[model samples]
Target: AQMPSAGGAQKPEGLETPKGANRKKNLPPKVPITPMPQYSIMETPVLKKELDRFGVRPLPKRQMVLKLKEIFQYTHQTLDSDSEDE
Candidate 1:
């Protein structure tokens, strides 16, 4: 009778590397990447104050516009509601 070897095809208890070990996954090429602006956030007071109001400072130009839109939308809603109450 032949005895089966303990280490034939299976790795030892904790010696195996997980799948994709040390490898970086590739990001999809079609994804749009937002580029940083040339100027600093501190340079623009109007932009900085608006972002600060929402507690969302230090965002890029694209993100700044999005945040401003939310602020404007809320202001418009409040104006319409106040007029309705009168």
Candidate 2:
């Protein structure tokens, strides 16, 4: 019985001499495809003291709840009518 050899039909790995290898040795290294310019850093105030000056407190929870219920009822009726056509 013959023992199997470890190296079988495998090509040794090394840097491949591409087609353009003989073209030029003095070529400059590649640079970025596109040059990026410096941009201004954005800064924003978290608190809105100026808006508070206008007294723009959001609507009361009770009123908001009533408005949402009315909106949902109107939407349900519209959707029901649309489904009747199908």
Candidate 3:
């Protein structure tokens, strides 16, 4: 059922038709984003020792996925206005 128009005389902004110039109804989605892979810095004992000296460590795959997810969420919020408002 239709609700009463906002203003009887002026006519509430048209819900049926857009007011502006005819524009594309359905815009195409943006290209998908893929994250770059984390690299293995070094494998040799000496290189491993160096990494240890620098406090380097390997993270589990699950942790890596979580980090990527957070990165994506932050990036998404940065781009989307409505989501950012909430």
- lDDT for every model? 0.40, 0.30, 0.37
Tens-digit per-residue lDDT, 1-78, candidate 3: 232344233433333233124442331123222222112222357545654565645757467446545555455421
> Per-residue alpha-carbon lDDT of model 1 for 12-74, expressed as tens digits?
354213213545223222322221221122236754674576577676778866665555544
Clashing pairs in 1: none
Worst 10 residues of 2 by lDDT: 33-42
Clashes of 2: 0
**lDDT minimum window of 10 residues, candidate 1:** 31-40
Give lDDT: candidate 3, residue 62. 65
| Predicted model with the maximum TM-score | 1
Error of 3 at 64 (Å): 0.7
**Residue-wise C-alpha lDDT for candidate 2, range 1-86, written one tens digit per residue:** 22224533334353223223355212112321111110111111412342244343655646644554454444432222313374
Question: Ranking under TM-score, best-scoring first?
Answer: 1, 3, 2
Model 2, residue 79: distance off in Å is 8.5
